[PDB]
Subunit: 193 residues, 2 copies
């Protein structure tokens, strides 16, 4: 373990480290490796999408939050609100504890599969999860997305992209930005316009 530089404005650091970034305004996100949850490439793709999308405070749902990394980054980047969801107790623990390590106590957490039983709508839905689960998320997006709502997917293997692209088209979503690092794909998504 050491510092994972994601961008000019984001680095990830293990909780024990005493790290001073050369850029004083580069945000440092502390994570506890002893807790559950990831993939550095897919995290970076999702983060670049969030950096692109967050031109004003947006309401955010981070689906399949795992360690909470993306929910935490969204909060630091000025989200209007953040809901983080996952299926496991240990994700709920990791997200809360990792948030707290970064001095954040107001990220809302819900133990739930995808967006089942999530009442509100959001400006930004973010999901770094495997493509077969994304396929189940796609038909849920519309009813949980504000008008002008945007979506960021990551964790897509390149071989899975046709199936993702077809399901997005079928649900009237377009891809504004496609990113590929190694075999991994990230997408910035909005309603067909």
């Amino acid at each position: 373990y050491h510092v994972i530089n994601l961008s000019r404005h984001l680095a990830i650091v293990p909780e024990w480290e005493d790290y001073q970034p050369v850029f004083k305004d580069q945000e440092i996100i502390r994570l506890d490796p002893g807790l559950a949850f990831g993939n550095h490439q897919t995290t970076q793709l999702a983060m670049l999408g969030i950096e692109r999308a967050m031109v004003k405070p947006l309401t955010v749902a981070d689906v399949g939050t795992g360690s909470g990394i993306l929910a935490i980054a969204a909060h630091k980047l000025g989200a209007k609100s953040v809901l983080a969801t996952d299926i496991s107790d240990e994700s709920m623990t990791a997200a809360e504890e990792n948030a707290a390590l970064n001095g954040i106590y107001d990220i809302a957490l819900q133990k739930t599969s995808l967006l089942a039983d999530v009442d509100g709508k959001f400006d930004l839905i973010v999901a770094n999860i495997l493509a077969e689960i994304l396929l189940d998320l796609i038909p849920q997006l519309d009813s949980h997305l504000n008008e002008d709502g945007q979506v960021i997917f990551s964790g897509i293997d390149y071989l899975q992209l046709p199936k993702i692209e077809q399901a997005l088209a079928e649900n009237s979503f377009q891809i504004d930005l496609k990113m590929r690092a190694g075999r991994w794909i990230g997408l910035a998504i909005s309603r067909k316009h």
Copy 2:
């Protein structure tokens, strides 16, 4: 043409010199431009720069045009920035746009690509036609520091296979490929 605010990212917006813009986020940097390639290719190159600038890097912006990418790199905390173009009009625009943002230490050189450029850089940025990028590719090695990175934008997706070929032949690899509409941006580094 008419020019409006271009909201690039959380940390950057491009604003026409005259336009009074108060960003919602207090710390979203504003780049002022007179008048002010296009939106899409600029945004891809910017994402590349945002990803790459994890510490102060020495930067070369090739085919600078308005000087937008040179200025953005400077604002994101580049150690130094050299901007090149063949055109006298571009040299003027880049100088004036830099001054409009209170920047006076971007180096400017009127030259084709990296011919006549002495020295090497941590980061080479070029948002230009793919045909010109093809000529730039063999110039990269001798102008790039070890662990140096290269950002290309301005590629139409149909012209990508020839760029990929020329990069491979010059012992470069693509770390990140970005596509928005028909436009391609690339983050590039030395192979192994």
